[PDB]
């Protein structure tokens, strides 16, 4: 009962973290451009 | 909000630096010799019966006891006020300055 | 308003305590405060027994005026009186003004039957050793007067024991109508009324319900200057009452209770010269605070804990001792943390 | 006098308290003097301080409370040599009736000694540095099943967490042939695990090893301290050694990944043969490692064993699967089932002689249902003070709790064990000692407190223990050198010391003095009957008993212990001549014949019933517990729980009788905690009357011995075998192994063989019927009263 | 032991109740009462509330010795009076004694303070009627009969009502050590209606609304229930919380005419069925005008009183509608 | 990165507690009217001492809530520019 | 065994939301000083 329905709804907070894993990637790239302007 | 918790890691890492020097100075120094230190062996005596003296002794260390957490609690409460109050006033401008300008827009909408 | 109201009461306890204190260093109370002849059943402790039934039968009947609505009928007074003389109240009484640890070799705490009929003997073996004071005579003047600041400290002694008693009776009459005054309905009303029977104490439980981890374990470590079997009564009703209704913000803070009491390595840290165990009467102290906290939180009833890190479970394993304990800690703590979105929600 | 409450401030306790006078009494007592004492009790006054201890500089004495006041010239008495001692400008200069020292009023001190600068033999360690961290070199076995090698790696990475973040750390996997891993190294190899390899089958001495390692001492290793420049260099450690021994906190990635590619052992094992298995080899370069870089260092060699050796040294059974492991009626009568334990059982007597002179301990966790050869392997636990837990898989609780306690931190947060440790011994001059028994090696210190007789470990006021713990408890026998009563004045005090210098887990040295004081008896040799204690005589005997069958035969142990019996109850007690009615015992005599009934059945000296290794095991605990765990082993607690009895649990004595249906019955014997519940219990909640809450009384019984079964679990080293238990189950064996038939045969066919045929409703409640040979309770209580009373 | 317990405190609350109803039946009691008196603060409310504090002290501390803790400690005394002074103690008397069913011409519920006020006015109107009973001259002997009783008559209820404040201002002295101090310091536990009707419906006490209720029947029968029926057809709605459980006692009253007469030991008052054949007649047209208000949202506080509702009626017509429309509890 | 350095002091700050207390149980070691008047002061300010901590924690407890309402209405600033930033998109879509 | 596999899923997700949280904030620092180097 208190195990079951606290746990799956912290997977709706776990749905998110491939949003920051994605955005990660995104600032890679951003990096990687001010880095070609940089030299 | 930040600059001013590392406030908060070097007050608290210096009232330990001192704290711990007091208790490294008192110490060394009350138990290093033997007089002195046999005035801990015999102690207030690991035996009951108070014996009206030595439970004044005991109501008084659990009042300088509370006496440092208030210290430290009031040091606490202080320092709180200066996360807290800055969430009034700048956001507020910004409430501001973007409602004129938003009115604004809609004022100039409504002529053609 | 308050605070002085707790200060005088505080000193009612106290200076009791220290009274008996004195009281058993001559040797005068002897004979009711030793467990072995409590159940020896010694001839001279059923004159002491029945010294102590027949003073309260008279003190509540020639000390005792007609207090409010006590003043209309005559019946009113009789459970008055009845509920001075009941078995709960003396055994309160017995209780908290500090008297088993102080008992002659006591080897186990008493039930409630026999813990009164312990306190009946207190007032009566004071009531006869005053009458054997006040019997012999006036052979040496000067031992006369010692004779006589000794009857004097046991003559107030008895009615400071009495005066507790007839107020944790008039406690009692008040309280009874109050509880007779009033499964969903009988069942559940039954087994609350229990819960607020044995509460836990009000300061440690908005503590809880606060947060701030020193606020909080201030509050553990004052509450053991109170009588051993008696103060973590407090602490084990406390925490069983809102365990399981906390809401998930202090969830973590109950962890970063935990851990912190059951480390002495993240406290007292590595300092240039130290010798740790000094007064070991404060660092068996933290043991009993990590002890009765966290074995009590094993019988809290709810099977899901969070926690900060995989060394926070860690950590809890670290010291008290292995057997059961940890196996049921542990198991509960599976969902861990996301601190910095507890503070943030998304949605 | 309270004898519980001296165990509880000095840490000792004595079987005879009032001592014997004359060397003729002290023989016709017939019980030598002896006594208990554990150098690590949690003392209730015990009281901590650093200065320099004032040692009594010609004799070895030092100020305990029993010295001489003497406040008018500053010159004191010598407690065991009586010579004038004069005190230092300032150790007196405030002295009065209102002033005092510390120790000459509190005889349990603990000393932190003052660390003098370092001695030439750790070069790299500054004046006023702390002492190493102590050692773990996990031993591993991996020839076992992979089942049980997964629950092993999920023990091991719980225990290398479980051990200070400072401590340091080494490992040996160890199949065929013995891999000393690679801790070490820099911040560029991390990702791929280097092991050294040695051929398991030969003999490689502890000089060689160091040799293939690099370990070995160089003879112009002097480039002293000339290095400006050299990084950041642990200086404890030399760069050879720091390969293989790492801080837990800094090879804590590697020694994981170490642990998940830890697989069963590669080599194909014959379906007929055993596994091949290099154990001895295994302990041998473990030892040989810790020689060359951690000398007198704290060391705890954690060897996990899963079964027997078979290959290279101390190897106990050969490959070819026909032929079985020994037994006791093996050992009895020479089979050849056993031709390697002689040079299996001497090679580990030579590493324990290795690792007393290096002062590393070793300490076995067995876990396996075939014999992992104990009997030979038992000998470095009891010559370090290590411990042995063994356990029949390294998955059941045996094994996981006692694993977790011994890395269990006391209130500082540092462990609860100390190394090195140096058992120092003083007596006056009326009585000397005879030897030590437990986890103690003497050293050969000669001196004029040496007696001539020897218990155990003589030739020494001074022994070696490189591994105590809060129970380990060591027997110290003594005996008195007076020959006559008018050399002593009436009331006189004699008095005896003991010192402990041992390393502790901080990495300071200390030094605990324990002195204590007892009384000489008048020249009557009734005077010393108050003074007997029939608890630590029982652990007196039972403890010489177990060495003494050692050399000799465990039957002629028996008879030694029977007329001993008989000498000691013919003394002490009041009777008349051949009259068996009128004997009586007193209260100190009163339960120490019933413990020689339990020691003469146990398997402590009995070897029906038993495999050598668990002999072996109940032998090295009982060498190394305390008063109060010696009596749970030798006499089985039984305690009663039932809705007639409110309150305390009712200790019930071990027969049949005591086994009721409505009764639940808590067996502790030290190896066995066993909850077992009555038939009507069973009957009663079949159905489930416990469950449905017209009947909830007996769910409150039956959750009643958890609390209990839960306490005698925590405090407890090692951890016993926890069952859980009901009326005709298979697991209720444990109990009535130990309970003991109400009814023998002799009682049956001896009488009253017509006034039984004729009456009554078929039978009555199912009695439960037993069968055993041995010699009941009240049958020995006549024969030895009627023994006693005729002589 | 217990369950005679229960029957004594219902013997005395029930009577605290009806010596303050009768009180007022007869009338002697009105200045501090009424509530735009009260909300004025007019001379003759600031006099009892004066007086009315000051006997309320003077009771505590010497009236009442010292009976316990103040044997020697003077402080735990002072803390008796202080818990019988307590704010939310005479609200929670003023709960229990149901005097905002006595209270007239208010239709809102009253705070904490403002009921702590008018609790202390009762006791300080007791305290000056009193005073002037006894003061007056010994002149005429019809009069003589009437204040030779009433004086200690009004005495016997002057002392009273300020000592029932005593309990109920001890079980607050009483809370107070479990929840200030430590919990463990204490034992534990085993279209044209009668439009001078109209507005006293939803503002005015029972006493003060039955003087009217006996004249309305007086009229005669079809101009009698026209004026009622009317009336109450679009005012039930319109009573709201504590008017709308001045309702329900107002059928507890008529309807059920047995705790209306005081049941003191020794005496009761009669009435004929011909003084009741006009008052249970008008309270019977109240049950068959509260039958066609068919008013769902009707709201109760207590269950003793509506098993008696129902059965004042004998199993009519109506006694399945008011299960039907009375389902909701409220307190206060 | 708040967190993470609110986490550590609070560790802190029990160091600095126990260390405080084992000072204050060595300074009243040694130091050295009626001793039934002078328990009175020392534990009337206990519970004074008592009064004031746990005023304050309800303050500090405060605090808290209102220093948490950072993101739950600056985003709902963002969230309420949007949608009537929105509303304008769609009329000109439309 | 569902409920172990959803714990052990969210044992090594929240550690790896520590990672790239952690490491999120060394490139945002990055892009801050990127920028000012290119001033």
């Not at chain 2, 060394?28 to 230190?37: A, V």
């Not at chain 4, 005879?16 to 209730?44: H, S, Y």
């Not at chain 4, 605990?621 to 010696?630: D, P």
């Amino acid at each position: 009962g208190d195990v079951a329905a606290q746990l799956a709804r912290v997977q709706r907070d776990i749905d998110q973290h491939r949003g920051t894993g994605k955005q990660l990637g995104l600032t890679f790239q951003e990096l990687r451009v001010s880095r070609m302007s940089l030299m | 909000q930040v600059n001013v918790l590392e406030d908060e890691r070097t007050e608290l890492q210096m009232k330990v630096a001192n704290l711990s020097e007091r208790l490294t100075e008192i110490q060394s120094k009350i138990m290093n010799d033997p007089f002195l230190s046999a005035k801990y062996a015999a102690a207030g005596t690991p035996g009951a019966v108070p014996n009206a003296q030595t439970q004044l002794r005991e109501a008084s260390a659990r009042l300088a006891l509370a006496e440092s957490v208030n210290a430290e609690l009031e040091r606490r409460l202080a320092f709180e006020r200066s996360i807290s109050r800055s969430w009034q006033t700048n956001l507020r401008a910004m409430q501001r300055e973007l409602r004129e300008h938003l009115a604004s827009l809609a004022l100039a909408s409504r002529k053609s | 308003m308050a605070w002085i109201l707790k200060g005088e009461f505080e000193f009612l306890v106290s200076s009791l305590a220290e009274r008996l204190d004195i009281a058993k260093c001559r040797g005068l109370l002897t004979s009711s405060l030793d467990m072995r002849l409590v159940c020896s059943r010694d001839p001279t402790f059923a004159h002491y027994y029945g010294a102590g039934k027949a003073y309260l039968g008279r003190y509540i009947e020639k000390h005792l005026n007609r207090t409010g609505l006590g003043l209309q009928s005559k019946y009113m007074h009789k459970s008055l009186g009845a509920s001075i003389v009941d078995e709960c109240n003396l055994a309160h009484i017995f209780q908290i003004l500090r008297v088993e640890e102080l008992l002659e070799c006591n080897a186990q705490c008493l039930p409630v039957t026999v813990a009164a009929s312990v306190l009946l003997a207190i007032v009566g073996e004071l009531d006869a050793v005053r009458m054997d004071l006040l019997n012999m005579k006036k052979d040496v003047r000067e031992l006369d007067n010692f004779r006589r600041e000794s009857a004097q400290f046991l003559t107030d002694t008895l009615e400071f024991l009495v005066e507790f008693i007839v107020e944790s009776g008039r406690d009692r009459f008040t309280y009874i109508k109050e509880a007779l005054i009033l499964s969903d309905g009988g069942q559940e009303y039954l087994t609350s009324l229990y819960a607020l029977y044995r509460r836990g104490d009000l300061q440690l439980e908005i503590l809880l319900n606060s947060g701030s981890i020193l606020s909080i374990w201030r509050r553990l470590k004052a509450l053991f200057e109170l009588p051993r079997a008696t103060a973590q009564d407090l602490i084990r009703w406390a925490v069983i009452r809102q365990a399981p209704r906390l809401n998930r913000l202090r969830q973590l803070i109950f962890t970063r209770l935990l851990q912190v009491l059951c480390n002495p390595s993240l406290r007292t840290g590595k300092i240039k010269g130290d010798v740790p165990d000094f007064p070991r009467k404060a660092l068996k102290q933290d043991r009993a605070i990590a002890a009765t906290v966290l074995s009590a939180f094993a019988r809290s009833g709810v099977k899901a804990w969070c926690y900060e890190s995989e060394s926070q479970k860690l950590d809890i394993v670290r010291g008290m001792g292995g057997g059961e304990v940890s196996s049921k800690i542990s198991s509960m703590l599976c969902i861990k943390v996301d601190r910095g979105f507890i503070d943030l929600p998304m949605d | 006098m309270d004898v519980h409450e001296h165990e509880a401030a000095t840490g000792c306790r004595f079987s005879w308290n009032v001592w014997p006078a004359t060397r003729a009494e002290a023989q016709k007592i017939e019980l030598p003097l002896g006594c208990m004492f554990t150098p690590l009790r949690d003392c209730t006054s015990l009281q901590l301080v650093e200065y320099e201890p004032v040692r009594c500089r010609v004799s070895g004495c030092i100020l305990n409370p029993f010295c001489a006041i003497d406040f008018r010239s500053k010159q004191w008495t010598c407690p065991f040599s009586l010579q004038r001692n004069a005190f230092p400008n300032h150790y007196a200069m405030h002295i009065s009736e209102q002033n005092l020292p510390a120790e000459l009023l509190y005889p349990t001190i603990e000393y932190i000694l003052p660390q003098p600068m370092p001695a030439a033999n750790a070069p790299g360690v500054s004046a006023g540095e702390s002492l190493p961290p102590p050692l773990f070199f996990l031993v591993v076995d991996t020839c076992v099943i992979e089942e049980e090698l997964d629950q092993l790696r999920d023990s091991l990475m719980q225990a290398l967490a479980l051990m200070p973040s400072d401590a340091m750390v080494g490992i040996i996997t160890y199949g065929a042939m013995a891999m000393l891993h690679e801790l070490g190294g820099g911040s560029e190899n991390v990702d791929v695990m280097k092991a050294h390899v040695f051929r398991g089958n030969k003999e490689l001495t502890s000089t060689q090893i160091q040799q293939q390692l690099g370990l070995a001492r160089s003879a112009n290793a002097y480039v002293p301290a000339g290095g400006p420049g050299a990084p950041a260099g642990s200086p404890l450690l030399r760069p050879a050694a720091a390969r293989f021994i790492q801080p837990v906190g800094e090879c804590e990635y590697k020694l994981t990944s170490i642990l998940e590619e830890l697989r069963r052992d590669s080599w194909p094992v014959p379906s007929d043969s055993r596994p091949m298995r290099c154990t001895g080899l295994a302990l041998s370069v473990a030892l040989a490692v810790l020689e060359a870089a951690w000398y007198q260092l704290p060391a705890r060699v954690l060897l996990f064993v899963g079964g027997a050796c078979t290959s290279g040294p101390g190897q106990v059974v050969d490959l070819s699967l026909c032929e079985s492991i020994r037994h006791h009626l093996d050992l009895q009568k020479d089979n050849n089932n056993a031709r390697f334990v002689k040079k299996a059982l001497k090679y580990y007597t030579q590493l324990a002689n290795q690792a007393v002179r290096s002062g590393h301990a070793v300490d076995i966790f067995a876990c396996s249902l075939d014999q992992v050869g104990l009997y030979e392997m038992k000998v470095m636990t009891e010559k370090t003070g290590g411990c042995v837990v063994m356990g029949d898989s390294f998955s059941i609780n045996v094994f996981k709790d006692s694993l977790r306690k011994f890395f269990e931190t006391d209130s500082t947060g540092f462990l609860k064990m100390g190394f090195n440790a140096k058992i120092e011994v003083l007596c006056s001059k009326e009585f000397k000692v005879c030897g030590a028994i437990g986890p103690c090696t003497g050293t050969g210190k000669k001196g004029c407190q040496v007696s001539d007789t020897i218990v155990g470990e003589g030739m020494t006021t001074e022994w070696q223990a490189a591994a105590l713990d809060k129970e380990s408890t060591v027997a110290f026998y003594f005996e008195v050198t007076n020959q006559q009563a008018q050399n002593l004045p009436p009331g006189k005090q004699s008095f005896l010391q003991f010192q402990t210098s041992y390393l502790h887990p901080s990495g300071r040295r200390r030094l605990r003095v324990t002195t204590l004081s007892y009384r000489f008896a008048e020249p009557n040799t009734i005077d010393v009957a108050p003074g007997f204690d029939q608890e630590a005589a029982a652990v007196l005997m039972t403890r010489l008993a177990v060495f003494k069958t050692e050399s000799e035969e465990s039957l002629d142990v028996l008879r030694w212990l029977d007329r001993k019996l008989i000498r000691l109850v013919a003394r002490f007690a009041d009777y008349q001549k051949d009259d068996p009615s009128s004997f009586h015992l007193s209260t100190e005599f009163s339960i120490y014949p019933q413990f020689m009934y339990h020691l003469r059945r146990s398997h402590f000296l009995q070897t029906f019933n038993a495999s050598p290794d668990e002999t072996a095991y109940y032998r090295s605990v009982l060498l190394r517990a305390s008063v109060m765990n010696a009596l749970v082993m030798i006499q089985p607690a039984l305690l009663e729980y039932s809705f007639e009895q409110q309150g305390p649990p009712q200790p019930v004595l071990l027969d049949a009788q005591a086994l009721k249906p409505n009764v639940i019955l808590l067996l502790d014997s030290f190896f066995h905690v066993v909850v077992w519940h009555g038939e009507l219990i069973h009957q009663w909640r079949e159905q489930g009357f416990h469950n449905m809450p017209e009947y909830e009384n007996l769910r409150q019984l039956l959750q009643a011995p958890l609390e209990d079964a839960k306490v005698i679990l925590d405090e407890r080293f090692p951890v016993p075998k926890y069952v859980q238990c009901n009326s005709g189950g298979s697991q209720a064996r444990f109990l009535l192994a130990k309970v003991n038939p109400s009814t023998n045969y002799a009682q049956t066919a001896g009488g009253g063989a017509a006034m039984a045929g004729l009456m009554g409703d078929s039978g009555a409640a199912g009695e439960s019927f037993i069968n055993t040979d041995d010699v009941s309770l009240k049958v020995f209580m006549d024969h030895l009263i009627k023994l006693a009373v005729q002589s």
